[PDB]
Every structure is written in C-alpha cells, then in structure tokens.
C-alpha cells in the first residue's frame with residue numbers, strides 16, 4: 001500500500017513554504033501527497049505566476065495532487081489583514097474540507113487511489129484536525145513559526161486569566177513602559193515582557209479574532225498525534241522543554257530545508273529578482289547590508305523614508321528588498337541620497353529576491369530583518385547576524401530571544417530614525433557589537449549544519465517523522 005498524506009497550510013508564504021518542503025520530501029520517499037490550497041491562495045497564485053508554474057510537473061503529477069477548497073474570501077483581502085483571513089478560514093473551510101476528504105475516499109474505489117492515511121495540518125488550520133478526527137484519520141500538526149513564538153501563543157490563556165487581555169485601558173496598548181512589564185511566570189522564557197508576547201494580544205476587543213483563534217489553535221494542537229516544529233532544538237532548548245508538558249510529542253526538524261538539502265512549483269506571488277546575486281558578486285566579502293521584511297508586513301511611508309536615509313548614510317553598500325506593497329498608501333519616491341547611491345552602484349533596491357541564496361552570498365555581512373521565522377532560519381543556516389525590526393505576530397518574541405538568548409542579533413528602535421539606523425548598522429558592520437553577534441551567528445551556523453547533516457538531531461527527527469508517522473500507511 002502507498003501512504004497518502006494530505007497537507008493543509010495557512011495561506012501565507014511563510015506557512016506554505018515549510019509544508020511544501022515536507023510535501024516534496026514525502027513525495028520523494030514514494031508517498032502520495034495531496035496539497036490543499038484555499039481558493040484565495042490558489043487564484044492569487046494563478047493570476048501572478050500562471051497555472052503551469054503553480055501546479056506540479058508531469059513527472060510528479062501521478063503522486064502529487066493539488067486540491068482547492070472554498071474559503072469565502074475576496075482575493076482583495078491583503079496579507080497584512082491576518083484577522084480577516086483567520087476568521088474567514090475557520091468559519092468557511094471546514095465543510096469544504098470535509099467534502100474533500102469524502103471525495104478522496106470515493107476515489108479509492110473510483111480510480112484505485114490510495115486511502116488517506118494521515119493529515120498534516122498547519123496549527124492555524126484547525127478545521128483540518130477536526131475533519132481528520134471525524135473521519136478517523138490520524139492527524140499531526142505543523143507549527144510554522146518559532147518555538148518561542150508558540151510558547152507565547154500558548155500563554156494567551158494565562159494573559160486572559162490575569163486580566164491582561166483584553167486590555168482594559170486602550171491608552172496602554174502602545175504605552176512603552178506598560179509593554180515593558182516583565183511576565184515572570186512564563187516557563188522557559190523567564191525574561192518575557194508583555195511586549196515580547198506575539199503582538200495580537202494587544203487588543204481591547206473581548207471578541208478579538210486573533211485571541212479567540214489562538215486559543216482554539218492551542219486546544220487543537222494539544223489533541224494532535226504529534227507536533228512538528230521547524231526549529232533547532234539546541235537553539236530553543238529551554239523553550240521546547242517547557243512546551244513538552246502541553247503538547248503531544250514534539251519533533252524539532254529545523255532547518256527542514258537544510259535537512260532535505262543534505263539528503264518545480266511556485267508558491268509566491270512575487271518574482272524573485274535574478275540580478276541580485278550578480279550584483280553581490282561585484283562587492284567585497286562581508287560588505288553588504290541586506291534588508292528584507294518578509295511577505296506579510298507593511299510599514300508607513302515615513303518609516304520607509306527613514307530606513308532609506310539610514311541606509312544611505314550607514315557607510316556600507318546595501319541590497320534592499322522593498323516588496324512592491326510593503327509601504328502603506330500611495331507610492332512615494334526614495335530619497336535622492338539613496339537614489340544616487342543606486343546610480344553609483346553602491347546600493348540596489350529590488351522587489352523580491354532568492355532569500356536563502358542571498359543570505360549565503362559571501363558579499364553579505366548583515367541581515368536587517370522583520371524577524372519572520374523562515375527568514376531567521378535562513379539567516380541562521382547562512383551564519384548572518386541580524387539587526388531586528390519586529391513588526392507583528394511572534395516577531396517580537398523572536399527578537400527578544402535573538403537579543404537575550406540566542407545572541408546572534410541586536411534590535412533597532414521601533415520608531416525608525418535615519419541617524420540611529422545608520423549608527424546601529426555601522427556598529428553591526430564594524431563595531432564590537434557586530435563582532436559579537438557575528439561570532440555567535442557563526443556558532444549557530446555550525447550547530448545548524450551538524451543538526452541537519454545525516455545523523456544530526458534534526459535529521460534524526462525528520463527520519464522519525466517521515467517514516468514512523470507519515471509513511472506508515474496503516
């Protein structure tokens with residue numbers, strides 16, 4: 001019999017990426033895979049890159065099925081409207097997914113298809129676990145961000161119990177002294193402050209979607225057969241040991257993409273700029289500041305201008321990925337100082353890049369990052385120190401660990417100002433600060449390589465997951 005694994009990501013590129021990594025590995029190991037897209041995600045991908053590039057090749061088409069489910073969303077809903085996405089998916093996708101499972105079962109008789117043997121749902125996509133359990137199909141969940149991020153979400157309930165969520169005083173939502181308050185009761189992260197919790201807790205709404213959905217997700221994941229985390233156990237050991245008490249067995253597989261590399265489908269709405277790596281080839285080793293904020297976050301036009309002026313005055317060449325819709329509001333021209341540096345060849349601004357390859361390029365010496373987890377995993381594998389500007393979600397949690405525990409990063413002020421940006425970049429490029437963070441980044445690069453190579457801790461967890469949980473085919 002052939003195992004048949006159905007995988008269901010949340011519609012964001014940072015969620016699709018790790019589940020697609022796993023789906024391709026399972027297909028390589030001989031499994032049948034059904035990858036489930038929401039119609040929102042599928043139609044947006046089609047209009048950006050065309051059906052041929054989004055769907056599987058003909059060589060893999062036999063055992064790699066793409067299925068699409070309804071979600072009731074307009075394609076106009078932007079990626080930064082996380083609450084709108086989350087609320088529609090949890091309300092609209094369960095019955096479409098239940099129907100999909102039924103049809104996959106009918107295809108056993110109808111076309112000799114393999115019965116479904118496991119569902120791997122993103123933790124967010126609680127309907128996938130609900131439908132699998134109803135149908136008596138094993139399900140395992142994949143949390144796509146950091147362990148420390150999960151630990152913060154897990155403690156949303158405790159915030160509610162302590163009267164901290166919802167915020168009873170709206171004036172405290174952005175009060176920096178209040179947000180600095182230590183939360184000494186979080187196991188595994190004694191240094192958590194209120195601001196270091198994933199940012200969706202900062203709400204006055206007692207029916208807030210993201211708080212509600214978080215609680216649903218934690219309860220769902222606690223009932224799963226296992227939890228997959230795309231992190232390095234050695235990096236997040238104290239956090240993972242604290243999470244162990246609240247979840248089924250946890251498999252730390254990170255960086256999954258590097259485990260796979262040790263040993264045909266576009267998942268992005270943006271086209272990776274091919275000039276990047278050639279431009280970096282022309283720059284000295286370690287000389288370039290690489291700036292990128294991932295696939296969902298947006299910033300203000302004022303923040304964008306201060307980043308631009310800071311980059312122009314920081315003393316280093318720079319590669320800035322400025323996502324086409326990253327700035328809120330109408331298009332504003334970049335400052336002349338930056339535009340002149342681009343004209344001189346000292347800087348380069350592109351809409352999207354091949355991020356893992358850029359971070360591994362010898363010309364890059366620093367990553368200015370929003371602290372999205374996949375981006376941090378790519379920085380960790382590459383050995384790049386991080387200058388952090390967290391935006392939303394668990395980016396704040398990740399930044400707290402980058403600064404206080406992992407040791408491979410430093411933080412910018414949330415209020416962007418060109419002079420402080422230039423000063424901190426300079427410190428990271430030539431100061432004792434950067435020497436320390438870069439040295440620690442080198443240590444984590446070695447640790448990641450050891451974990452991902454055959455026999456390493458993450459490699460061993462991937463083998464156990466792939467074999468004993470997913471290819472069993474009972």
Ligand SMILES: O=c1ccn([C@@H]2O[C@H](COP(=O)(O)OP(=O)(O)O)[C@@H](O)[C@H]2O)c(=O)[nH]1
Pocket residue numbers: 012013014015017268292293294295296297321351352353354355356371372373374375376378
């Ligand atoms: O120029 C870019 C920037 C990002 N990414 C990819 O987009 C995802 C960003 O995920 P992350 O978890 O860092 O952040 P999010 O987008 O969820 O904020 C990762 O797979 C990156 O490799 C990319 O392909 N090109």
Ligand SMILES: N#C[C@@H](O)c1ccc(O)cc1
Pocket residue numbers: 010012014082086124213214296392393394
């Ligand atoms: N930010 C962000 C997204 O990655 C996200 C989606 C759903 C969640 O429940 C939490 C976070």
